[PDB]
């Protein structure tokens, strides 16, 4: 574009102000604003086709050629190798929506792009970009209040989980896993409700292990109330099933003790050598005897062990797992109700965990084995074991189920619920239009633009569903204003009715509010930029 400085002097002497000013570029003012708006519109029009049940996916290829098929706006924009700084800002915006909510990552981008596209026409008419940003802030406040007004509430109890299942089904309608729609919603709900702190209103996702294994069918995905590990029993002649398992969780390798300090044990005689030999033997025997006397029928170590320990476990009928990772050790403890023991001397019958079933699982013609721990009493940990025909659908299933879990988390944090299908956006657009009518200052135009931008989500849903955008949206808006019903939206699935409260299409109020707030704040930060400086090449 334009250069930093183009004089070189009114006297002919060199004029060097900035380093590599000749290789550097600069864009200033309205042309800079329009470049920003063009970039943002490009990103938003890329994303808008991945919106809604009839939304399509994108195939992302990384540097090393790995393929990722997804409908998740945050994953798409993260996999996208963007160079434009405004596109980077939009990627950050979507990532922020994903961090805070875990859903809406495409709505935020579409809405921000629409806001900037309307600011484009407002700037053409000559309004100051800061005035545009302030009108957008005003309209965003109005829309947030209207969302709080039209919101509904759902019960987050563990007895009737139908509202939560409906919410999760709405969230998962747009993902490839809608083939197992209700199974996935059920397992997301049961997962969060099993592991969720109702009193604190907190949900720790480290306690939800989402594991995937190629093979089987997507319908085989299930919720394990317990843990799955990628290990097998240490000895090949151990039993592959253990019922009523009393579990000893240990972070001590079944090996002779060893000081952490630099140590040298000196052997100075045949008697010293034989004493050392007998010490080693008796250490192994004493370890196994302590584990047996604790009453355990199963051992789980974190640091692996050797041939003598393995065979002694086998002889003493103590199936054992080794080389289990720290996180899985923690999850097994939490699930079985056991305490992690750092050495055998500290092991007691009360520190043991209990699992009604510990089994080794095969996966066809593979030679790889997995260990399932389940039938615990009150497991505060849980595992989601995902199956499918390829790693692409497995990864998409993982991220979609993450979206569902995050949505249930947002419900546990705030039970208020708005109805989707663009209905909430149409209602907020109506409210913003009314407030713009009551506004007599120059921000009227910015607020009308905000309404026209809010209306892009119903239009996008209709377009992706093949309906005519303008016709469908105007008819449902007219119906909303005539018969007061903010649950009137786009019949994306062609169920006949436009009532999203009847179709059980459900969004989170904090989710929608976060969408609107993030889009408005980022659009403000973009409109406030009027000069770009970048290094050459």
């Amino acid at each position, epitope marked *: 574009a334009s250069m930093g400085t183009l004089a070189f002097d009114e006297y002919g002497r060199p004029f060097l102000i900035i380093k590599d000013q000749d290789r550097k570029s600069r864009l200033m003012g309205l042309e800079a604003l329009k470049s920003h708006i063009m970039a943002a519109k490009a990103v938003a029009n890329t994303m808008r086709t991945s919106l809604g049940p009839n939304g399509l996916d994108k195939m992302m290829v990384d540097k090393d050629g790995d393929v990722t098929v997804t409908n998740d706006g945050a994953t798409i924009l993260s996999m996208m190798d963007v160079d434009h700084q405004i596109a980077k800002l939009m990627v950050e915006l979507s990532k922020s929506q994903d961090d805070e909510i875990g859903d809406g990552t495409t709505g935020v981008v579409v809405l921000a792009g629409a806001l900037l596209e309307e600011a484009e026409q407002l700037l053409d008419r000559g309004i100051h970009p800061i005035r545009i940003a302030d009108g957008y802030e005003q309209a965003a406040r109005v829309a947030i209040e209207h969302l709080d007004k039209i919101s*509904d509430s759902v019960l987050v109890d563990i007895k009737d989980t139908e509202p939560l299942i409906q919410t999760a089904k709405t969230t998962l309608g747009s993902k490839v896993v809608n083939s197992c729609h209700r199974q996935m919603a059920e397992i997301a709900v049961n997962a969060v409700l099993t592991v969720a702190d109702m009193e604190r209103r907190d949900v720790d996702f480290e306690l939800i292990k989402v594991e995937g294994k190629v093979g089987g069918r997507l319908e085989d995905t299930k919720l394990i109330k317990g843990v799955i590990v990628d290990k097998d029993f240490s000895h090949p002649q151990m039993p592959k099933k253990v019922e009523d398992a009393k579990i000893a969780i240990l972070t001590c390798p079944f090996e002779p003790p060893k000081p952490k300090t630099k140590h040298k044990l000196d052997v100075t005689s045949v008697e010293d050598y034989k004493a050392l030999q007998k010490y080693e033997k008796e250490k192994f025997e004493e370890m196994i005897q302590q584990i047996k006397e604790t009453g355990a029928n199963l051992a789980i170590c974190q640091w692996g062990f050797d041939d003598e320990a393995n065979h002694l476990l086998l002889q003493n009928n103590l199936p054992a797992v080794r080389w289990v990772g720290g996180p899985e050790i923690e999850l097994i403890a939490i699930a079985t109700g056991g305490r992690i023991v750092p050495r055998f001397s500290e092991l007691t019958a009360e520190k043991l965990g209990f699992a009604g079933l510990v089994q080794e699982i095969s996966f066809g013609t593979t030679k790889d084995k997995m260990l399932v721990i389940e039938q615990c009493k009150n497991s505060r940990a849980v595992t989601i074991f995902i199956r499918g025909g390829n790693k692409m659908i497995i990864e998409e299933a993982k991220r979609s189920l993450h979206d569902a879990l995050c949505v249930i988390r947002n419900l546990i944090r705030d039970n208020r619920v708005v109805y989707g299908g663009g209905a909430a956006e149409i209602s907020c657009a109506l409210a913003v239009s009314q407030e713009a009518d009551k506004c007599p200052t120059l921000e009227q135009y910015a607020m009308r633009a905000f309404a026209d931008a809010l209306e892009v989500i119903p239009m996008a849903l209709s377009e992706n569903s093949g309906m005519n955008p303008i016709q469908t949206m105007t008819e449902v808006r007219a119906r909303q204003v005539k018969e007061m019903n903010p649950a009137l939206g786009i019949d994306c699935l062609h169920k006949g009715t436009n009532d999203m409260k009847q179709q059980h299409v459900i969004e989170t109020l904090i989710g929608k509010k976060q969408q609107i707030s993030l889009a408005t704040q980022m659009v403000r930060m973009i409109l406030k930029i009027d000069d770009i400086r970048k290094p050459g090449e």
Partner: nanobody, 109 residues
């Protein structure tokens, strides 16, 4: 949230108007509570105008709903001493949850 305002010659007309925070008044009803008795519904009208009356008094009702201001007017004739009680108004709001019924202070006739 929903603020309700309400306004004997043996036809009496009693009004009930709603204001405040809402976006829809799902149902509007008139209730009566005689002293040492249990509240019953004089009448009630829906948004679609469909009104269902009660059994001890029916056929003489002229309950009318003004949607332009979300208010209602019940014209009752054939007055009787047993109609002498406190007349309560009921307002079903927004979605229609059990925490959405809004009562008035009641008007004694």
């Amino acid at each position: 949230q929903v603020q309700l305002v309400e306004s004997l010659v043996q036809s009496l007309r009693l009004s009930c108007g709603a204001s405040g925070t809402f976006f829809r008044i799902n149902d509007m009803g008139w209730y009566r509570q005689a002293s040492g008795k249990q509240r019953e519904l004089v009448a009630s009208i829906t948004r679609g105008g469909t009104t269902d009356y009660a059994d001890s008094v029916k056929g003489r009702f002229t309950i009318s709903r003004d949607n332009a201001k979300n208010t209602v007017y019940l014209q009752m004739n054939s007055l009787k001493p047993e109609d002498t009680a406190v007349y309560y108004c009921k307002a079903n709001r927004n979605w229609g949850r059990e925490w959405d019924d809004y009562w008035g202070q009641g008007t004694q006739v």
